[PDB]
Design a protein around this motif. Sequence first.
Motif, PDB file in Angstrom:
ATOM      1  N   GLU A  80       0.779  -1.323   0.004  1.00  0.00           N
ATOM      2  CA  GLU A  80       0.181   0.105   0.043  1.00  0.00           C
ATOM      3  C   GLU A  80       0.918   1.286   0.089  1.00  0.00           C
ATOM      4  O   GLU A  80       0.783   2.108   0.929  1.00  0.00           O
ATOM      5  N   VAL A  81       1.757   1.519  -0.968  1.00  0.00           N
ATOM      6  CA  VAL A  81       2.818   2.344  -1.245  1.00  0.00           C
ATOM      7  C   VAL A  81       2.663   3.088  -2.383  1.00  0.00           C
ATOM      8  O   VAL A  81       2.532   2.270  -3.442  1.00  0.00           O
ATOM      9  N   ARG A  82       2.710   4.155  -2.436  1.00  0.00           N
ATOM     10  CA  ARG A  82       2.800   5.040  -3.744  1.00  0.00           C
ATOM     11  C   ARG A  82       4.262   4.682  -4.681  1.00  0.00           C
ATOM     12  O   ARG A  82       4.870   3.893  -3.843  1.00  0.00           O
ATOM     13  N   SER A  85      10.435   7.040  -4.354  1.00  0.00           N
ATOM     14  CA  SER A  85      11.219   7.063  -3.169  1.00  0.00           C
ATOM     15  C   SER A  85      12.058   5.652  -3.035  1.00  0.00           C
ATOM     16  O   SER A  85      11.995   4.958  -1.951  1.00  0.00           O
ATOM     17  N   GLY A  86      12.969   5.259  -3.915  1.00  0.00           N
ATOM     18  CA  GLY A  86      13.876   4.496  -3.873  1.00  0.00           C
ATOM     19  C   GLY A  86      13.494   3.111  -4.435  1.00  0.00           C
ATOM     20  O   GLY A  86      12.184   2.959  -4.351  1.00  0.00           O
ATOM     21  N   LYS A  87      14.454   2.185  -4.605  1.00  0.00           N
ATOM     22  CA  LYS A  87      14.051   0.749  -4.898  1.00  0.00           C
ATOM     23  C   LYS A  87      13.631   0.337  -3.768  1.00  0.00           C
ATOM     24  O   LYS A  87      14.058   0.249  -2.628  1.00  0.00           O
TER      25      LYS A  87
ATOM     26  N   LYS F   1      -2.763   5.676   3.777  1.00  0.00           N
ATOM     27  CA  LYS F   1      -1.317   6.127   3.158  1.00  0.00           C
ATOM     28  C   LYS F   1      -0.280   5.972   4.288  1.00  0.00           C
ATOM     29  O   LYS F   1      -0.611   5.905   5.510  1.00  0.00           O
ATOM     30  N   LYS F   2       0.803   5.681   3.616  1.00  0.00           N
ATOM     31  CA  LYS F   2       2.126   5.409   4.451  1.00  0.00           C
ATOM     32  C   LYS F   2       2.913   6.566   3.892  1.00  0.00           C
ATOM     33  O   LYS F   2       2.651   7.808   3.444  1.00  0.00           O
ATOM     34  N   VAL F   4       7.468   7.130   3.364  1.00  0.00           N
ATOM     35  CA  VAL F   4       8.925   6.452   3.258  1.00  0.00           C
ATOM     36  C   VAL F   4       9.873   7.474   2.473  1.00  0.00           C
ATOM     37  O   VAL F   4       9.539   8.589   2.465  1.00  0.00           O
ATOM     38  N   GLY F   5      11.013   7.013   2.359  1.00  0.00           N
ATOM     39  CA  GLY F   5      12.032   7.828   1.766  1.00  0.00           C
ATOM     40  C   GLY F   5      13.263   7.500   1.745  1.00  0.00           C
ATOM     41  O   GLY F   5      13.708   5.950   2.005  1.00  0.00           O
ATOM     42  N   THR F   7      16.427   7.422  -0.270  1.00  0.00           N
ATOM     43  CA  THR F   7      17.276   6.756  -1.382  1.00  0.00           C
ATOM     44  C   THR F   7      18.733   6.776  -1.004  1.00  0.00           C
ATOM     45  O   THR F   7      19.394   5.624  -1.229  1.00  0.00           O
TER      46      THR F   7
END
Lengths: 135, 164, 48, 120, 238, 81, 83
Positions: A80-82, A85-87, F1-2, F4-5, F7
């Motif tokens: 459930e992630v867009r 924002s990285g691999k 919604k979640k 993240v980040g 990289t």
Amino acid sequence: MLLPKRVKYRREHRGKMRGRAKGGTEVHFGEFGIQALEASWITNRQIEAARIAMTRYMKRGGKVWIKIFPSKPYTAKPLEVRMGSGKGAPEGWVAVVKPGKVLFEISGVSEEVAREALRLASHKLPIKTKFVKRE
Amino acid sequence: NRLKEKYNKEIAPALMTKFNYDSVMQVPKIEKIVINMGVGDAVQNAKAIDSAVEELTFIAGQKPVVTRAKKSIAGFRLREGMPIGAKVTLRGERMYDFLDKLISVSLPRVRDFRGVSKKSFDGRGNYTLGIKEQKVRGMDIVIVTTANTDEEARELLTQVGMPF
Amino acid sequence: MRVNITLACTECGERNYISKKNKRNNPDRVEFKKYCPRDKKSTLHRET
Amino acid sequence: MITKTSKNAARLKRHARVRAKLSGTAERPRLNVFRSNKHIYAQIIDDVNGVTLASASTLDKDLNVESTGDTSAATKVGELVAKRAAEKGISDVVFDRGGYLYHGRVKALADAAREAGLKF
Amino acid sequence: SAHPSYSRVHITAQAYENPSEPPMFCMLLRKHIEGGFIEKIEQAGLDRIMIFHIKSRNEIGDETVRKLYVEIMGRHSNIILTDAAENVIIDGLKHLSPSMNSYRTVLPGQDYKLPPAQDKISPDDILRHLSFQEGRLDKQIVDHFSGVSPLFAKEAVHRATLPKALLALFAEVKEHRFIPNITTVNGKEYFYLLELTHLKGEARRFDSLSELLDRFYFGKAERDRVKQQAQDLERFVV
Amino acid sequence: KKGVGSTKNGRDSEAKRLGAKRADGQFVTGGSILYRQRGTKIYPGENVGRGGDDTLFAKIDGTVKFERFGRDRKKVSVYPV
Amino acid sequence: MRLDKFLKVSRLIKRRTLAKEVADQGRISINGNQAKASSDVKPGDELTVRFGQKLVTVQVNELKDTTKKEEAANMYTILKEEK
RNA sequence: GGGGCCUUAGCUCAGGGGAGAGCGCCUGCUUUGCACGCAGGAGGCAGCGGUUCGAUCCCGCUAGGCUCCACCA
RNA sequence: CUGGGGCGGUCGCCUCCUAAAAGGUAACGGAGGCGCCCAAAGGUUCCCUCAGAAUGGUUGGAAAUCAUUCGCAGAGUGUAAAGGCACAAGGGAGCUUGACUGCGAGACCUACAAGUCGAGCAGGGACGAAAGUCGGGCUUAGUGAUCCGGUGGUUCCGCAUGG
RNA sequence: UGGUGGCGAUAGCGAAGAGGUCACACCCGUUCCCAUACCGAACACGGAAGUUAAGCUCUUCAGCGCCGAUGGUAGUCGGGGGUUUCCCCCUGUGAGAGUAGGACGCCGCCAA
């Protein structure tokens, strides 16, 4: 559940399964083997399922010689992630397979037993296969 | 000038006759002597170098060369540099004189001397030796020869009269 | 510390040159020889 | 067991280390030297064409002397090759200490040629 | 030794082991006593305490003196160094702050002071002062005399009105008439100037009290530790 | 919604336009450069010079030719008319 | 630093708890001034203390926190005792 | 889930060149003496990987814990 | 900037992959580094060649230093990586300061600003017998505009003239 | 023979042999030039008693390494098609690997 002990890069591109195999196209360690007729990725859980299947059917039988190893890792982002924002993080390990490629072999065991075991393994695998023997 | 002429006259005709070499240029001889001190104690006591380097000088008239590290070993608390050990090469006539001196004095003056170690060759035709006494530090010395196999070196030193 | 420096002549009094140095390894007022385009010669230059 | 390298091969390496910086042409040839234990030889070369122009040696039947291997012989052969390269009026060359030193017989020979007229 | 149970003094043929580290106390002794000169020894009035009157030259070659005190009280023994005239403490092994609201104090600089000497006649007088009807008088000989062990008191009380034993043994000690032995009552190895008086224990005698101390403590330093380990393990096994 | 980040792999250097800049058989002026590089993928030859940036330039005018230093090693050269 | 911490490290008092207790009783003082466990200290400080009737006066030389045993008493000096 | 801090002896702490300061509980010893002690329970860098001659000390990945945030329809 | 925004993370430079065999080429794509260091770690001349393995040998020990044969290179190359280098660009020694001044044909890259290479000339030098090399370092990062002020020098100007 | 250059080790590694009166080397000693972080090993200086053993040259071989076809195949520009995470057809091109085989040297200048 096989694993490469150590790896340079925990994250790789996926790749492309074009063409036929380079090598491992014919049984030479064993007598009666199985090969593929398609191309696909295969997982350590699949190979160990097939392995334990044939070994349970055989119950003492000879030798096997898998002919692969899941060197490739494969990632999967969390749920459930867009996008972006990285691999994504690694999930497991994978072996890549071309057609014409031998996967499992058998020796020390008769042809009928071998064919049945490899049938059982094929049904655990996703791809189309063929029974093969040494020349 | 004893052992040079002794070597030539006694050994080389006799030895060539014994081994049936083709030519005198095939004769084995000593190419050189070398000695090393091998002291990694200077890390603790930097004054441990000139200590016994002076002794190497009073032993052999040739000045020595402080050896040095080439790598680093935390196991011995060492890095590259930090001169440990000292070396002397030896190739000529005081070579032979020193060897006469050894066989005359240094070997017998050991307080338990006997048949010295028969086998400390390198399987090539060259001999090594260690000493512990002389602080009472010893050393490690080496004899290097023109011998291709090793039995000719054996016979050579026996005919010299170096003990065994 | 690594620090800038000028290197002035002694006959000319002119600065003419710059460089850098460690204050630790080269604490003292250093000096070299360089070309003074006024004296038109090699010439000892001194730090300030 | 001890081996031993040929000092000639060493000399070849040193010679090549030199040769990397130069080569003999017309109107700037190369003057090469050889230093046998019993003789000393000299040649002058257009390294472009791979050709010797003039040569000299103790072995030359002219000016036969006793040493063939000291600085006197080196001087004599130097002046000889100098007049050779004079009658082939080049007068301007480059020197090739072939992995040797510009110290001894080599130095004496080169000085002889300098004095005889050849300009390095 | 100010080691509480093993606190003592001794002279040993066994120079045990000089340390690799010079500790603070050792170096402070080196500062003010090294190359000393033991003018005199004193007993501190028969309490379990000793004094060394010592001389030594200072850092300018001028002769100076000091008073080294060794109080062996048991669990709260200590070793102290003091000035001769000023009586000021200079060093101390067990610094003791007055949070114990005690009479005396240890710390350096302070004027040295001794413990409160109890109201005991340090040497018939017991038949005068003490009512022999009291019973268990091996306890209360401590209440009359200075230098007492309950061991000594019991072994003397078991001689059965017995002032004779006390006076005879005091004369013995005063005359240095004792016999340095070690007693062993089924283990529990004890020792004292006098021999064993009554108990069943084995006895081994010596020529020197110092050798007695040697042969005693040289084992008990670690024997008891091994016993502790053994019992701690035995508990678990059981 | 979640959420993240991170990289931390999001950069690269500016592309430096290496390679050959003139071709074999091509006429060249003095001082022209021929093959930007780092180290020596290619060496100089006749009438050609190397710089502090390991770059190759023509000392004269002429025509370019690329060759090999015997085995597994390349070369350029300028030859005039 | 703080008084209670100072007393513990100097091993005047064995427990910071006890130091707090006595300071809250106000049995002690600093520079003639009644003080508290949170009271700030420093070198040169002159400290008055009580232990029942035993009154004490000391002087502060140093202060730290690692404070091994014998090095504790270096931190300060006794001056005087009253009652 | 994200970010930050922390994860060294039973407890609390310091410390790229070799982990050492203090304290406590239980047991045992111990004794003339105003709580003044001693020995053992035991003293071991959360883990994984890497760079260095070396890592607690630098870097990176992961786990456990504490705090902060996890909003707009 | 943002696979809505916010919070998080990042913002410039260098190296590699992605990148599709010139070059170039994106993403909150994948891995890592820089905001320096050396007055010798520079220049020149001359010298020689590494890491590891097996043997023998006090302390020496699996592992110092030792001789020993094998050994294109498994080492090193100040630092990250790529490219490259053993005829040295790697490692030693001597002498030195070209880590110079004025410049610069002509090229590269480039929107611009800028950045990069450069034979060769002059002056004065360093090393070297000489040829000849030297305008920093094995190449690539190691840094920022303009305005404003400050310091030094200047056959420039200095509001009628001299300052 | 020696010296000195050029050509991608088809030149090399390795094994076996033959020669040195000349020549090249090995080799004999440091008094001088100079030198060895130690020293006449090396570098220099001089010498020539003896040695072809080594080095160096000349022969042999195909064990290692090296070179290297033809054909075929993969791949592929282009065109087209199809059940299209891929596959197939056509003109054309065309490797690597594996072979056939080649090769233990070709060319020059000077000196006797």
